[PDB]
Homo-oligomer: A and B are copies of this chain.
């Protein structure tokens, strides 16, 4: 007997953080942290070749957007929400543009609202980043509302778990500690780039050699290069780290450089994986990325288009026999990837400043947000309506636009 579905009454967007509020706010922006966080400690970037912007990513402006929160209220007064990285500018997009497609549709009209946001912003989105972050947030807000309205987890709507539990590896400066917390592997940032030559390679390879000595042969080790390299540097580094069984090397190149990724994968040591995707948006970009022949694609659910895009990226990887392993986005990834046969493991990105505690991935912004206890999360944990979390409204949410 037919469940009756509400319309959509209001869409609202606030921000915490970024260049118009409290720097260090955390939440949706992973890199809105304080001083002396691991995530800002001399990480190789495109900018790190410049001496002012070598030490800190925060210095070049990695923290200026902050968290976007987008909330959608049905006319039965029930809400759903999600968070992403756009902040005040993303509030403008939701509130001076996108609201015309959200407001007044059914709660179940998610794909249509998605297609309309894609169609309408195509002239100014191009292909990812700020606009697509905003689009993904709306998309996830919508899936939350719908799962709450129905009284079901997103993961059951999507057709159920294919695994009882999600396995995690941990991202950050301390694989040794993450091994003690029960994680399956650990992914470190690179600290030196192309401008540092062989000394850079020696230095980053030595950090891998050390953690192999510490963690032993079965715990996975990976390197994350945040767009900082070229093909030759990436190939010298992949080969330096080969004696230590580096599982994969990740995001070596700026996202436009599809032909670079093709060539990098051709030059990779036998058995070593090349990965990318976290700065890619749209299904069609990921088609192009997949066909470079890289092993694993890594959308951020909050950056790539949303859960709607992500399920399509997973199908596309699976048609090719490839894995999709999203760039860790808490419950949003969780409800997705527990249904994906081609996501055998997931990413926890340490928001703990020294990678010693299981601090929540989206802390403070998300209430009862789960953590990988013993680097695992059981399916029974996610068994809450929608995405299973609530908005910490104690947080100092600014609202620069309404309509």
Residues of A within 8 A of B (CB): 1-3, 5, 18-20, 45-47, 50, 53, 60-62, 64-65, 85, 88-89, 92-93, 96-97, 100, 106, 108-112, 115-116, 118-133, 143, 146, 150-152, 156-162, 194-195, 197-199, 202, 217-218, 220, 227, 230-232, 235-236, 239, 245, 253-260, 263, 267, 269-271, 273, 279-288, 290, 293, 295, 308, 311-313, 315-316, 318-321, 339, 341, 344, 383-385
Contact = CB atoms under 8 A, between A and B. Distances in A.
A126 B281 contact: yes
A254 B64 contact: no
Q: How many copies does the complex hold?
A: 4
Contacts of A230: 321
Given A230-B321, A236-B271, A96 B156 contact: no
A239 to B, nearest CB: 5
A119 B1 contact: no
B271 A235 contact: yes
Contacts of A64: 96-97
B319 A97 contact: no
B120 A125 contact: no
A128 B127 contact: yes
Given A2-B384, A316-B319, A124 B129 contact: yes
Contacts of A116: 47, 50, 53, 60
A5 to B, nearest CB: 7
Contacts of A2: 151-152, 383-385
Nearest to A293: B263
Nearest to A282: B256
B218 A122 contact: no
Given A61-B120, A321-B260, A109 B161 contact: yes
Given A50-B116, A235-B270, 5 more contacts: A60-B119, A123-B279, A126-B129, A195-B344, A232-B295
User: Which of A89, A161, A286: most chain B Cβ within 10 A?
Assistant: A89
A319 B283 contact: yes
B119 A47 contact: yes
A111 B341 contact: yes
A300 to B, nearest CB: 11
A126 B132 contact: yes
Given A131-B129, A320-B287, A47 B120 contact: yes
19 contacts: A1-B385, A2-B152, A46-B119, A46-B122, A47-B116, A47-B119, A53-B116, A62-B123, A111-B162, A125-B130, A126-B128, A127-B129, A129-B129, A197-B220, A283-B319, A287-B319, A312-B315, A312-B318, A312-B319
Contact of A284 (B5, B256, B287, B312): B256
A344 B89 CA distance: 34
A133 B152 CA distance: 30
A168 B287 CA distance: 29
